Design an enzyme around this catalytic site. Structure first.
Site, PDB file in Angstrom:
ATOM      1  N   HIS A  61      -2.060   0.494   3.880  1.00 54.99           N
ATOM      2  CA  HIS A  61      -2.184   1.577   4.846  1.00 54.99           C
ATOM      3  C   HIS A  61      -2.111   2.916   4.120  1.00 54.99           C
ATOM      4  CE1 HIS A  61      -1.599   4.080   8.398  1.00 54.99           C
ATOM      5  NE2 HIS A  61      -0.514   4.569   7.823  1.00 54.99           N
ATOM      6  N   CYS A  96      -7.925   4.351   8.710  1.00 52.67           N
ATOM      7  CA  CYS A  96      -6.982   5.319   8.150  1.00 52.67           C
ATOM      8  C   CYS A  96      -7.486   5.885   6.827  1.00 52.67           C
ATOM      9  CB  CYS A  96      -5.609   4.666   7.971  1.00 52.67           C
ATOM     10  SG  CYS A  96      -5.617   3.044   7.165  1.00 52.67           S
TER      11      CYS A  96
END
Ligand SMILES: *[C@@H]1O[C@H](CO)[C@@H](O[C@@H]2O[C@H](CO)[C@@H](O[C@@H]3O[C@H](CO)[C@@H](O)[C@H](O)[C@@H]3O)[C@H](O)[C@H]2NC(C)=O)[C@H](O)[C@H]1NC(C)=O
Ligand SMILES: *[C@@H]1O[C@H](CO)[C@@H](O[C@@H]2O[C@H](CO)[C@@H](O)[C@H](O)[C@H]2NC(C)=O)[C@H](O)[C@H]1NC(C)=O
Ligand SMILES: *[C@@H]1O[C@H](CO)[C@@H](O)[C@H](O)[C@H]1NC(C)=O
Ligand SMILES: *[C@@H]1O[C@H](CO)[C@@H](O)[C@H](O)[C@H]1NC(C)=O
EC number: 2.3.1.-
Length: 285
Positions: A58, A172
């Site tokens: 992430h 992301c």
């Protein structure tokens, strides 16, 4: 009949989430409004990475100011998490499958060092003026209201270099890259550090446009193909039976059904089918 990658479609506003979409964990629980910096401020810009196919990371961006003293985290992720952004729900009162696939930006005070330094990366990549930051802030807001849906799959022709790309994801990491490109537009200068990102790839031939949600499901549409897409999506949600269905559709029969820009495409799968890479995307210059 198209240009190489289908471009990501933006909207004039972000609709409120349908009440059917509910999250187990709340989206952006500590999200504060983006403050306005002093123009001559010095703002360190950090690269943030942490684990969510061994290396599925992430991404987020850190900011620290010298005048404020405080630091901040900025990220962009799913309102109802990855599965809801990747596969739809089938409700019996609707001919079309329903998606809760909205992703958005989140900004809050503080950087959780342990979260990123443990099994990930925390490295300063730039230093920008407050002015730059403020300008960046404005762009983020616009982006947050025009790019409203999260998309998981990168669709490419082959793992080769120079292979044609059918679809780019919108997640992301792409948000981080958009922010860094925007900062580069302002003249910001990045350090030379290897920056690798996670990319989930489907490998297929040239996709075929099947149609929008009313052109497929409903009265004015194909029935056999609508039931085909439904039969394709059903196993991905409530096990072994579902795993065999998925392997037969994706591997044996080399078929994928891709929701993109709120339209339905067909992917003739090939090659290693589904690969998860952790490859370099250089900082902008
Ligand atoms: C980008 O757009 C999204 C979606 O419109 C914005 O998400 C919303 O963000 C706010 C705060 O950032 C959330 O409110 C928070 O609620 C929690 C508890 O629910 C509370 O503890 C916080 O103090 C805050 O009040 C809100 O729930 C969230 N979602 C929606 C649907 O509004 C986001 O803020 C935007 N980001 C930027 C940088 O523009
Ligand atoms: C994905 O979306 C589904 C559908 O909105 C969410 O499932 C609901 O969750 C709420 C709150 O936990 C429950 O009250 C509902 O009964 C659930 N509905 C269904 C159809 O399962 C789910 O929470 C979302 N996924 C995540 C990770 O948040
Ligand atoms: C952010 O500030 C906190 C103190 O509020 C500190 O513990 C942390 O190390 C800082 N992180 C960075 C990347 O500067
Ligand atoms: C980053 O990606 C490149 C491919 O461009 C690869 O050669 C390199 O090994 C990767 N680095 C890490 C740490 O995974």
């Amino acid at each position: 009949r198209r240009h190489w990658p289908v471009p990501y479609k933006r909207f004039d506003f972000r609709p409120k989430p349908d009440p059917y979409c509910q999250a187990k964990y709340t989206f952006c629980p500590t999200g504060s409004p983006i403050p306005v910096m002093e123009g001559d401020d010095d703002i360190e810009v950090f690269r943030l990475q942490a684990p969510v196919h061994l290396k599925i990371m992430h991404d987020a961006i850190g900011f620290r100011s010298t005048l404020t003293g405080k630091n901040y985290t900025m990220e962009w992720y799913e309102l109802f998490q990855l599965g809801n952004c990747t596969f739809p729900h089938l409700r019996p009162e609707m001919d079309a499958p329903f998606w809760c696939n909205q992703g958005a930006a989140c900004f809050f005070e503080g950087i959780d060092d342990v979260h990123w330094k443990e099994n990930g990366t925390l490295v300063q990549v730039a230093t920008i003026s407050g002015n730059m930051f403020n300008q960046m802030a404005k762009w983020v807001k616009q982006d947050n209201e025009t790019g409203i849906y999260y998309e998981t799959w990168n669709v490419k022709a082959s793992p080769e270099k120079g292979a044609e790309t059918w679809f780019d994801s919108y997640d992301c990491s792409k948000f981080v890259l958009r922010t860094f490109n925007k900062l580069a537009e302002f003249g910001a200068e990045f350090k030379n550090i290897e920056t690798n990102y996670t990319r989930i790839f489907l490998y297929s031939g040239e996709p075929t446009y099947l149609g929008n949600e009313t052109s497929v499901f409903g009265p004015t549409g194909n029935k056999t193909l609508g039931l085909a897409i439904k039969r394709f999506y059903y196993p991905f949600k409530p096990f072994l039976l579902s795993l065999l269905q998925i392997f037969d559709a994706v591997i044996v029969h080399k078929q994928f059904y891709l929701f993109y820009n709120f339209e339905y495409w067909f992917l003739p799968m090939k090659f290693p089918f589904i690969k998860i890479t952790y490859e370099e995307i250089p900082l902008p210059i």
